[PDB]
């Protein structure tokens, strides 16, 4: 079981809303990490969709529509990407990442 789990595949009808799931392995607590999402259509470079820590701590990518939204299921160690009004151009590979912003130490190379 890796640190981050995403189901490999998903489908849904146009006009609809799906939720994508990024599950952080239980050796860590999502309560401190931020969830990041990237989109990548076939043959294109990834593009940063959004960052979500809480309703009061989030950021949308360069020119990413509001129909892409993030949420966090702390209790279930889950990060979510919700996409409403599903459109043909939403058809892509979606990658998640997670950043604590409180990663340190490593003074074990300078006594």
């Amino acid at each position: 079981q890796p640190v981050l789990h995403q189901p490999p595949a998903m489908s849904s009808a146009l006009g609809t809303t799906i939720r994508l799931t990024c599950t952080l392995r239980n050796d860590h607590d999502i309560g401190v990490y931020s969830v990041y999402w990237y989109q990548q259509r076939p043959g294109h470079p990834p593009r940063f969709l959004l960052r979500y820590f809480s309703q009061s701590d989030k950021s949308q990518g360069p020119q990413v529509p509001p129909r892409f939204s993030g949420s966090k299921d702390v209790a279930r160690n889950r990060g979510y990407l919700s996409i409403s009004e599903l459109q043909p151009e939403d058809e892509a590979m979606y990658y998640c990442a997670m950043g604590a912003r409180s990663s340190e130490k490593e003074e074990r190379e300078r006594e």
């Binding site: 890796p2 489908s11 939403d90």
Partner: protein, 117 residues
């Protein structure tokens, strides 16, 4: 351990067209190639939807997991996905057995094409 790790990613498919079964085809090794001591099976799977499918080759029923190369379902202009699968062998193996299948599976359905020398 998080920090700088990308998930494996979810392939999100948007369903915008009626379900369709693929028109599968199988092509045995050519000349110029067969008498060049090299075999290669071609299996083209076009005009389907959704663009999700899996290929299982099977010689005389028994599967083949050796030299099985497959392309990714690309979208054509008409808006139906296409695909290709190649199988490498020796002209000794080509005539040796008798059966060669391109068992395609799409949304439950199992189409199958067979050819022999």
């Amino acid at each position: 351990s998080v920090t700088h790790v990308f998930g494996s990613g979810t392939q999100l498919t948007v369903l915008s067209q009626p379900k369709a079964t693929p028109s599968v085809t199988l092509f045995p090794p050519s000349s110029e190639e067969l008498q060049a001591n090299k075999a290669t099976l071609v299996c083209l799977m076009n005009d389907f939807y959704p663009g999700i499918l899996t290929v299982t080759w099977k010689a005389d029923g028994t599967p083949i997991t050796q030299g099985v190369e497959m392309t990714t379902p690309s979208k054509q202009s008409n808006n139906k996905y296409a695909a290709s699968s190649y199988l490498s062998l020796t002209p000794e193996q080509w005539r040796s057995r008798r059966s060669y299948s391109c068992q395609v599976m799409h949304e439950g359905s199992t189409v199958e094409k067979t050819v022999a020398p």
